[PDB]
CSV table of C-alpha atoms in Angstrom, one decimal:
chain,number,residue,atom,x,y,z
E,1,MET,CA,-12.7,-13.0,10.8
E,2,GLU,CA,-9.9,-12.9,13.3
E,3,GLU,CA,-9.2,-9.8,15.3
E,4,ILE,CA,-5.4,-9.3,15.8
E,5,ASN,CA,-4.5,-7.6,19.1
E,6,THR,CA,-1.2,-6.2,20.3
E,7,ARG,CA,-0.9,-7.2,24.0
E,8,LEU,CA,2.4,-5.3,24.2
E,9,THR,CA,2.7,-1.9,25.8
E,10,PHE,CA,5.6,0.2,27.1
E,11,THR,CA,6.4,3.6,28.2
E,12,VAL,CA,7.8,6.2,25.8
E,13,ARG,CA,9.4,9.5,26.7
E,14,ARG,CA,10.2,12.1,24.2
E,15,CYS,CA,12.2,15.4,24.3
E,16,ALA,CA,10.3,18.4,23.3
E,17,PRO,CA,9.8,18.7,19.5
E,18,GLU,CA,12.4,20.7,17.5
E,19,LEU,CA,12.6,22.3,14.1
E,20,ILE,CA,15.3,21.2,11.6
E,21,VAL,CA,16.3,23.8,9.0
E,22,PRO,CA,18.5,23.2,6.0
E,23,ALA,CA,22.2,23.4,7.0
E,24,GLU,CA,23.0,25.9,4.2
E,25,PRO,CA,21.3,28.8,2.5
E,26,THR,CA,18.5,27.5,0.2
E,27,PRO,CA,16.3,29.2,-2.4
E,28,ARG,CA,13.6,31.3,-0.8
E,29,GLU,CA,10.8,31.1,-3.4
E,30,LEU,CA,7.2,30.2,-4.0
E,31,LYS,CA,7.0,26.8,-5.7
E,32,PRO,CA,3.7,25.6,-7.4
E,33,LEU,CA,2.2,22.4,-6.3
E,34,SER,CA,0.7,20.4,-9.1
E,35,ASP,CA,-3.0,19.8,-9.9
E,36,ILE,CA,-2.4,16.2,-8.7
E,37,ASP,CA,-0.8,17.2,-5.4
E,38,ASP,CA,-3.4,19.8,-4.4
E,39,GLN,CA,-6.7,18.0,-5.0
E,40,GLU,CA,-9.0,17.6,-2.1
E,41,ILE,CA,-8.3,13.9,-1.3
E,42,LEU,CA,-4.6,14.6,-0.8
E,43,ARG,CA,-5.1,17.4,1.8
E,44,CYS,CA,-4.4,14.9,4.5
E,45,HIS,CA,-1.4,13.5,6.3
E,46,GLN,CA,0.0,10.0,6.1
E,47,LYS,CA,2.1,7.9,8.5
E,48,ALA,CA,5.1,5.6,7.7
E,49,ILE,CA,7.4,3.7,10.0
E,50,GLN,CA,10.7,1.7,9.9
E,51,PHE,CA,12.3,-0.5,12.5
E,52,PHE,CA,16.1,-0.7,12.7
E,53,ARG,CA,18.1,-3.3,14.6
E,54,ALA,CA,21.2,-2.5,16.6
E,55,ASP,CA,24.5,-2.5,14.7
E,56,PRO,CA,27.5,-3.3,16.9
E,57,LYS,CA,30.0,-1.2,15.0
E,58,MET,CA,27.7,1.8,15.2
E,59,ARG,CA,28.4,2.0,19.0
E,60,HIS,CA,29.0,5.6,20.2
E,61,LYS,CA,26.5,6.7,17.6
E,62,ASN,CA,23.1,7.8,18.8
E,63,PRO,CA,20.7,7.3,15.9
E,64,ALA,CA,18.6,10.5,16.5
E,65,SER,CA,21.8,12.6,16.1
E,66,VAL,CA,22.9,10.9,12.9
E,67,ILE,CA,19.4,11.3,11.4
E,68,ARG,CA,19.0,14.9,12.4
E,69,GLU,CA,22.4,16.0,11.0
E,70,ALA,CA,21.5,14.1,7.8
E,71,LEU,CA,18.1,15.8,7.7
E,72,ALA,CA,19.8,19.2,7.9
E,73,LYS,CA,22.2,18.2,5.1
E,74,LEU,CA,19.6,16.6,2.9
E,75,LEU,CA,17.2,19.5,3.2
E,76,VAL,CA,19.7,21.6,1.3
E,77,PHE,CA,18.6,19.6,-1.8
E,78,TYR,CA,15.0,18.9,-0.7
E,79,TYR,CA,14.6,22.4,0.6
E,80,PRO,CA,10.8,22.8,-0.1
E,81,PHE,CA,10.3,20.1,2.5
E,82,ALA,CA,11.5,22.7,5.1
E,83,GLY,CA,8.9,25.2,3.7
E,84,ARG,CA,5.3,26.0,4.6
E,85,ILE,CA,2.3,25.3,2.3
E,86,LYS,CA,0.0,28.3,1.6
E,87,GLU,CA,-3.2,28.8,-0.4
E,88,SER,CA,-3.4,31.4,-3.2
E,89,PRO,CA,-6.6,32.7,-4.9
E,90,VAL,CA,-8.7,30.0,-6.8
E,91,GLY,CA,-7.4,27.2,-4.6
E,92,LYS,CA,-3.9,26.6,-5.9
E,93,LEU,CA,-1.5,25.4,-3.3
E,94,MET,CA,2.1,26.7,-3.1
E,95,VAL,CA,5.2,25.9,-1.0
E,96,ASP,CA,6.6,29.0,0.5
E,97,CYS,CA,10.2,27.8,0.7
E,98,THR,CA,11.0,29.7,4.0
E,99,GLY,CA,13.4,27.2,5.5
E,100,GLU,CA,11.4,27.1,8.7
E,101,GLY,CA,12.3,23.4,8.9
E,102,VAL,CA,10.8,20.0,9.4
E,103,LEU,CA,9.6,18.8,12.8
E,104,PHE,CA,11.8,16.4,14.8
E,105,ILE,CA,11.3,14.4,18.0
E,106,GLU,CA,14.0,12.4,19.8
E,107,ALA,CA,12.6,9.8,22.2
E,108,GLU,CA,13.4,6.6,24.2
E,109,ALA,CA,11.3,3.5,24.9
E,110,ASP,CA,11.5,0.9,27.6
E,111,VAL,CA,11.1,-1.8,25.0
E,112,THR,CA,13.2,-4.0,22.8
E,113,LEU,CA,13.0,-4.5,19.0
E,114,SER,CA,12.5,-8.2,19.4
E,115,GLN,CA,9.5,-7.7,21.6
E,116,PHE,CA,7.5,-6.4,18.5
E,117,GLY,CA,7.5,-10.0,17.2
E,118,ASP,CA,9.3,-12.2,14.7
E,119,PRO,CA,8.2,-11.8,12.0
E,120,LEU,CA,7.2,-8.2,13.0
E,121,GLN,CA,4.1,-7.1,11.3
E,122,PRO,CA,1.2,-4.7,12.2
E,123,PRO,CA,-0.7,-3.8,14.3
E,124,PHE,CA,2.0,-1.9,16.2
E,125,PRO,CA,1.4,-0.8,19.8
E,126,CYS,CA,1.8,2.7,21.3
E,127,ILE,CA,2.1,4.2,17.8
E,128,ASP,CA,0.5,7.5,18.9
E,129,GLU,CA,3.5,7.8,21.3
E,130,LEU,CA,6.0,6.6,18.7
E,131,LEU,CA,4.8,9.4,16.2
E,132,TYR,CA,3.6,12.1,18.5
E,133,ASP,CA,0.9,14.5,17.0
E,134,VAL,CA,2.4,17.9,18.1
E,135,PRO,CA,-0.5,20.4,18.4
E,136,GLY,CA,-1.3,22.5,15.4
E,137,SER,CA,0.9,20.4,13.1
E,138,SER,CA,-2.1,18.4,11.8
E,139,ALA,CA,-2.7,21.5,9.7
E,140,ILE,CA,-2.2,21.5,5.9
E,141,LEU,CA,-1.3,25.2,5.6
E,142,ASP,CA,1.4,27.1,7.5
E,143,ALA,CA,2.5,23.9,9.4
E,144,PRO,CA,5.7,22.0,9.1
E,145,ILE,CA,5.4,19.7,6.2
E,146,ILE,CA,7.0,16.6,7.6
E,147,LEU,CA,7.6,15.2,11.1
E,148,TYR,CA,10.1,12.6,12.3
E,149,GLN,CA,10.3,10.7,15.5
E,150,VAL,CA,13.4,8.6,16.2
E,151,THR,CA,12.6,6.4,19.2
E,152,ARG,CA,15.7,4.6,20.6
E,153,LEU,CA,15.1,1.0,21.8
E,154,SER,CA,16.6,-0.7,24.8
E,155,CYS,CA,18.4,-3.1,22.5
E,156,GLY,CA,20.1,-0.2,20.9
E,157,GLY,CA,17.8,-0.5,17.8
E,158,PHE,CA,15.5,2.4,17.0
E,159,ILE,CA,12.2,3.4,15.3
E,160,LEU,CA,12.0,6.0,12.5
E,161,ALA,CA,8.4,7.2,12.3
E,162,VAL,CA,7.3,9.9,9.8
E,163,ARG,CA,4.1,11.9,9.3
E,164,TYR,CA,4.0,13.9,6.1
E,165,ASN,CA,1.7,16.3,4.3
E,166,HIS,CA,0.3,14.2,1.4
E,167,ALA,CA,0.0,17.3,-0.7
E,168,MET,CA,3.8,17.5,-0.7
E,169,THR,CA,4.7,13.9,-1.9
E,170,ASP,CA,3.3,10.4,-2.2
E,171,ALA,CA,4.7,7.2,-0.7
E,172,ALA,CA,7.0,6.9,-3.7
E,173,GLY,CA,8.4,10.4,-3.4
E,174,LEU,CA,9.0,10.0,0.3
E,175,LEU,CA,10.8,6.8,-0.5
E,176,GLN,CA,13.1,8.6,-2.9
E,177,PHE,CA,13.6,11.2,-0.2
E,178,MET,CA,14.2,8.6,2.6
E,179,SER,CA,16.7,6.8,0.4
E,180,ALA,CA,18.5,10.2,-0.1
E,181,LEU,CA,18.5,10.5,3.7
E,182,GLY,CA,20.0,7.1,4.0
E,183,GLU,CA,22.7,8.0,1.4
E,184,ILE,CA,23.6,11.2,3.2
E,185,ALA,CA,23.8,9.5,6.6
E,186,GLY,CA,25.9,6.9,4.7
E,187,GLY,CA,28.4,9.8,4.1
E,188,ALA,CA,27.4,10.7,0.5
E,189,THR,CA,28.1,14.2,-0.8
E,190,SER,CA,24.7,14.5,-2.4
E,191,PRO,CA,21.8,12.3,-3.5
E,192,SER,CA,22.3,9.9,-6.4
E,193,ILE,CA,19.0,11.0,-7.9
E,194,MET,CA,19.2,14.7,-7.8
E,195,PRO,CA,15.6,15.8,-7.0
E,196,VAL,CA,13.8,18.3,-9.2
E,197,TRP,CA,10.5,20.2,-8.9
E,198,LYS,CA,9.0,20.6,-12.4
E,199,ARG,CA,5.5,20.3,-10.9
E,200,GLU,CA,4.3,22.9,-13.5
E,201,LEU,CA,4.1,19.8,-15.7
E,202,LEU,CA,1.0,18.8,-13.8
E,203,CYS,CA,-0.4,22.3,-13.6
E,204,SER,CA,-3.1,23.0,-16.2
E,205,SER,CA,-3.3,26.8,-16.8
E,223,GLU,CA,-17.1,6.7,20.6
E,224,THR,CA,-14.6,5.7,17.9
E,225,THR,CA,-12.6,2.5,18.0
E,226,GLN,CA,-9.4,1.1,16.4
E,227,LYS,CA,-9.0,-2.6,15.5
E,228,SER,CA,-7.1,-4.8,13.1
E,229,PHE,CA,-8.6,-7.9,11.4
E,230,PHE,CA,-7.1,-10.8,9.6
E,231,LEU,CA,-8.5,-12.7,6.6
E,232,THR,CA,-6.5,-15.6,5.4
E,233,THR,CA,-5.8,-16.2,1.7
E,234,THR,CA,-8.1,-19.2,1.7
E,235,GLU,CA,-11.1,-17.1,2.8
E,236,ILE,CA,-10.3,-14.5,0.1
E,237,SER,CA,-10.1,-17.1,-2.7
E,238,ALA,CA,-13.2,-18.8,-1.2
E,239,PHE,CA,-15.0,-15.5,-1.9
E,240,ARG,CA,-13.6,-15.6,-5.5
E,241,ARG,CA,-15.5,-18.9,-5.9
E,242,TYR,CA,-18.9,-17.5,-5.1
E,243,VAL,CA,-18.9,-14.5,-7.4
E,244,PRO,CA,-20.1,-15.0,-11.0
E,245,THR,CA,-17.7,-16.7,-13.3
E,246,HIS,CA,-17.5,-13.6,-15.5
E,247,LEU,CA,-16.1,-11.7,-12.5
E,248,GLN,CA,-13.6,-14.4,-11.4
E,249,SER,CA,-10.6,-12.6,-13.0
E,250,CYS,CA,-10.9,-10.3,-10.0
E,251,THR,CA,-7.8,-9.3,-8.0
E,252,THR,CA,-7.5,-10.2,-4.3
E,253,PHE,CA,-7.5,-6.4,-3.9
E,254,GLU,CA,-10.7,-6.0,-5.9
E,255,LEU,CA,-12.5,-8.8,-4.1
E,256,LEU,CA,-11.4,-7.4,-0.7
E,257,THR,CA,-12.5,-3.9,-1.6
E,258,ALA,CA,-15.9,-5.0,-2.9
E,259,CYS,CA,-16.4,-6.9,0.3
E,260,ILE,CA,-15.3,-4.0,2.5
E,261,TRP,CA,-17.4,-1.5,0.6
E,262,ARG,CA,-20.6,-3.5,0.6
E,263,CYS,CA,-20.2,-4.6,4.3
E,264,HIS,CA,-19.4,-1.1,5.4
E,265,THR,CA,-22.4,0.4,3.6
E,266,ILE,CA,-24.7,-2.3,5.1
E,267,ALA,CA,-23.3,-1.3,8.4
E,268,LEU,CA,-23.7,2.4,7.9
E,269,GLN,CA,-27.3,1.9,6.7
E,270,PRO,CA,-27.4,5.2,4.8
E,271,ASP,CA,-30.4,6.8,3.1
E,272,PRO,CA,-31.3,4.6,0.2
E,273,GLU,CA,-30.5,7.1,-2.5
E,274,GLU,CA,-27.2,8.4,-1.1
E,275,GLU,CA,-24.2,8.0,-3.4
E,276,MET,CA,-21.6,5.6,-1.9
E,277,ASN,CA,-18.1,6.0,-3.2
E,278,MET,CA,-15.1,3.6,-2.9
E,279,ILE,CA,-11.9,5.3,-3.9
E,280,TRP,CA,-8.3,4.0,-4.2
E,281,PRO,CA,-5.0,5.2,-5.6
E,282,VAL,CA,-3.0,3.7,-8.5
E,283,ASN,CA,0.8,4.1,-8.9
E,284,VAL,CA,1.2,4.9,-12.6
E,285,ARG,CA,5.0,4.7,-12.9
E,286,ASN,CA,4.9,1.0,-13.9
E,287,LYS,CA,1.8,1.5,-16.0
E,288,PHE,CA,1.9,4.4,-18.5
E,289,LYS,CA,4.7,5.4,-20.9
E,290,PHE,CA,4.7,9.2,-20.7
E,291,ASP,CA,5.6,10.6,-24.1
E,292,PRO,CA,7.4,13.5,-22.6
E,293,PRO,CA,8.8,11.3,-19.9
E,294,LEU,CA,9.0,12.4,-16.3
E,295,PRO,CA,12.0,14.2,-14.9
E,296,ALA,CA,14.6,12.0,-13.3
E,297,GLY,CA,14.1,13.3,-9.7
E,298,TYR,CA,10.4,14.1,-9.6
E,299,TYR,CA,8.9,13.7,-6.2
E,300,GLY,CA,5.4,15.1,-6.2
E,301,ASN,CA,2.3,13.1,-6.3
E,302,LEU,CA,1.9,10.8,-9.3
E,303,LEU,CA,-1.2,8.9,-8.1
E,304,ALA,CA,-4.2,8.3,-10.2
E,305,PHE,CA,-7.4,7.6,-8.3
E,306,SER,CA,-10.1,5.2,-9.4
E,307,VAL,CA,-13.7,5.8,-8.1
E,308,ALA,CA,-16.5,3.3,-7.8
E,309,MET,CA,-19.9,4.7,-7.0
E,310,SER,CA,-23.4,3.3,-6.3
E,311,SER,CA,-26.6,4.2,-4.6
E,312,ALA,CA,-26.8,2.8,-1.0
E,313,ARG,CA,-29.9,0.8,-2.0
E,314,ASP,CA,-28.2,-1.0,-4.9
E,315,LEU,CA,-25.1,-1.8,-2.9
E,316,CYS,CA,-27.1,-3.3,-0.1
E,317,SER,CA,-29.8,-4.8,-2.3
E,318,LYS,CA,-27.7,-6.7,-4.8
E,319,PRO,CA,-25.2,-9.6,-4.3
E,320,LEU,CA,-21.5,-9.1,-4.0
E,321,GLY,CA,-21.1,-9.5,-7.7
E,322,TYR,CA,-22.7,-6.1,-8.2
E,323,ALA,CA,-20.1,-4.3,-6.0
E,324,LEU,CA,-17.3,-6.4,-7.4
E,325,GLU,CA,-18.1,-5.5,-11.0
E,326,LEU,CA,-18.2,-1.8,-10.1
E,327,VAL,CA,-14.8,-2.1,-8.3
E,328,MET,CA,-13.1,-4.0,-11.2
E,329,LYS,CA,-14.4,-1.7,-13.9
E,330,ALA,CA,-13.4,1.4,-11.9
E,331,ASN,CA,-10.0,-0.2,-11.6
E,332,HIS,CA,-9.6,0.1,-15.5
E,333,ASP,CA,-11.2,3.5,-16.0
E,334,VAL,CA,-7.7,5.0,-15.0
E,335,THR,CA,-5.5,2.3,-16.7
E,336,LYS,CA,-7.2,2.4,-20.2
E,337,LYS,CA,-5.3,5.3,-21.8
E,338,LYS,CA,-1.6,4.4,-21.8
E,339,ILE,CA,0.6,6.7,-23.9
E,340,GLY,CA,0.9,10.5,-24.0
E,341,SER,CA,1.8,13.3,-21.7
E,342,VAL,CA,1.6,13.3,-17.9
E,343,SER,CA,-1.0,16.0,-18.1
E,344,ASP,CA,-2.8,13.7,-20.6
E,345,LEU,CA,-2.8,10.5,-18.5
E,346,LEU,CA,-2.7,11.9,-14.9
E,347,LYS,CA,-5.7,13.9,-13.7
E,348,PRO,CA,-7.1,14.9,-10.3
E,349,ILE,CA,-10.4,13.5,-9.2
E,350,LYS,CA,-13.1,15.5,-11.0
E,351,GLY,CA,-15.2,17.3,-8.4
E,352,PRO,CA,-15.3,17.9,-4.7
E,353,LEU,CA,-15.1,14.7,-2.8
E,354,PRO,CA,-18.6,13.1,-2.2
E,355,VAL,CA,-20.2,13.3,1.2
E,356,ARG,CA,-19.9,9.5,1.2
E,357,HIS,CA,-16.5,8.1,0.3
E,358,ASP,CA,-14.4,5.3,1.6
E,359,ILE,CA,-10.6,5.1,0.8
E,360,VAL,CA,-8.7,1.9,0.5
E,361,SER,CA,-5.0,1.5,-0.3
E,362,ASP,CA,-3.1,-1.5,-1.6
E,363,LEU,CA,0.1,-2.1,0.5
E,364,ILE,CA,0.5,-5.8,0.0
E,365,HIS,CA,3.7,-4.8,-1.7
E,367,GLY,CA,9.8,-4.3,0.3
E,368,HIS,CA,10.6,-0.6,0.7
E,369,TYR,CA,14.1,-1.8,0.8
E,370,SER,CA,17.5,-0.2,0.1
E,371,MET,CA,17.3,2.4,2.9
E,372,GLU,CA,20.5,2.1,5.0
E,373,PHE,CA,21.5,4.6,7.7
E,374,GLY,CA,24.5,2.6,9.0
E,375,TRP,CA,22.4,0.0,10.9
E,376,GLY,CA,21.5,-2.0,7.8
E,377,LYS,CA,18.2,-2.0,5.9
E,378,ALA,CA,15.0,-1.8,7.9
E,379,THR,CA,13.6,-4.9,9.5
E,380,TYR,CA,10.2,-3.5,8.7
E,381,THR,CA,9.0,-0.5,6.5
E,382,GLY,CA,5.4,0.2,6.1
E,383,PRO,CA,2.3,2.2,7.1
E,384,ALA,CA,1.4,3.2,10.6
E,385,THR,CA,-1.9,3.5,12.5
E,390,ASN,CA,-10.1,13.3,8.6
E,391,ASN,CA,-12.5,11.5,6.3
E,392,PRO,CA,-15.7,10.4,8.2
E,393,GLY,CA,-16.0,7.4,5.9
E,394,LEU,CA,-13.8,4.3,6.1
E,395,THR,CA,-10.1,4.7,5.4
E,396,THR,CA,-7.9,1.6,5.5
E,397,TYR,CA,-5.1,-0.3,3.8
E,398,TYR,CA,-4.2,-4.0,3.2
E,399,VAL,CA,-1.1,-5.4,4.8
E,400,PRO,CA,0.4,-8.9,4.4
E,401,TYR,CA,0.3,-11.0,7.5
E,402,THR,CA,1.3,-14.5,8.5
E,403,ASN,CA,0.1,-15.9,11.8
E,404,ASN,CA,1.7,-18.3,14.2
E,405,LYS,CA,0.5,-21.4,12.3
E,406,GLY,CA,1.9,-20.2,9.0
E,407,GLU,CA,-1.3,-18.9,7.3
E,408,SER,CA,-0.6,-16.0,5.0
E,409,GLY,CA,-3.3,-13.4,4.4
E,410,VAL,CA,-4.2,-9.7,4.8
E,411,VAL,CA,-4.7,-7.5,7.8
E,412,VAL,CA,-7.2,-4.6,7.5
E,413,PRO,CA,-6.8,-1.9,10.2
E,414,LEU,CA,-10.2,-0.3,10.8
E,415,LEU,CA,-11.2,2.7,12.8
E,416,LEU,CA,-15.0,3.0,13.1
E,417,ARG,CA,-17.6,4.1,15.6
E,418,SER,CA,-18.0,0.9,17.7
E,419,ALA,CA,-21.6,0.2,16.5
E,420,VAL,CA,-20.6,0.6,12.9
E,421,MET,CA,-17.6,-1.6,13.6
E,422,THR,CA,-19.6,-4.5,15.0
E,423,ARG,CA,-22.2,-4.3,12.3
E,424,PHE,CA,-19.3,-4.3,9.8
E,425,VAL,CA,-17.6,-7.3,11.4
E,426,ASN,CA,-20.8,-9.3,11.7
E,427,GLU,CA,-21.6,-8.6,8.0
E,428,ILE,CA,-18.3,-9.8,6.8
E,429,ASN,CA,-18.7,-12.8,9.1
E,430,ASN,CA,-22.1,-13.5,7.5
E,431,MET,CA,-20.3,-13.5,4.2
E,432,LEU,CA,-17.7,-16.0,5.5
E,433,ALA,CA,-20.6,-18.2,6.8
E,434,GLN,CA,-22.2,-18.1,3.4
E,435,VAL,CA,-19.0,-18.8,1.5
E,436,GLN,CA,-18.4,-21.9,3.7
E,437,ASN,CA,-22.0,-23.2,3.6
E,438,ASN,CA,-21.7,-23.1,-0.2
């Protein structure tokens, strides 16, 4: 299992972080976050990144300035994003729309866009410096909800890095928002999709980083040595059953502890909501599927055991298809288990954002839970092999036991 390493490094320097408030008076109100947005597994942040190449006609236009003026203008419509999230009695989250503003960082880097590769894919170097974690902002409550870093590159290109409070929006909502930002920086009067709230509809009253590469041939090879009755499995399912079982064998937990593997599902493509969703909704619309087993059964039984659990969990959430949003979209049931890993499927453009410099040359993820939290990215190496890159952050011993265990599985798949 190949480790991918970024041998590139460079020096970043950033101004001191600033607060961007909406450019015009906006409603000062308390807006309810939905039962989907405020579940435990979403009380985290997430990181996205886009790379933009130089545009010769955009000379005399510093990208940080363009973006921060457009942020101010766009926050008039998305004004809750300038708010602060607070907790009421019985655990309901609210956005206090105070206009205190989103965090912003203008920076420069002694590096060129082309030095990130061609094609440019993860891992990305110096990402902790390209999306600086300002102290106290890692908080869910009373902290700025979103953070931008615009790093200018020596070629005149630039980097747009975002950290956002996952209680506020999901990847899809942030995409609607970033496309509204692109439109406003394009000169638009207002967004094409006028956002709405309506989240009441979903209210019911020692460590180590690393990135590893598995080629498609290795994945499909796996698919050959699982029982025929499980061969309809997705690449995602097979990869997730591998990761879950290998990680558990690496953790070596108490035999009876309940091991959970959890992943989100975008439902927009899937269900047909009978009261359909509002046109500009941008809260969370993720379903979550949960696969659970004793540590002893995961480590004791072959990969087919884990794989069946993953595939069947992947249809618990897909099986009821028409009705209300409150009917088909539920939070995870209880408090999160002690033992839970989180995987996300990213093998899927994120196109049509244009800020004057074109559409991004790359848009994707970047870089709490003490389990394993990772995502799958597409990757093609220098010889042409397409496959998946899995960024892992584990205690070093757990990492090498994990790597060795998936390498044992590769050894088995090839011996057979």
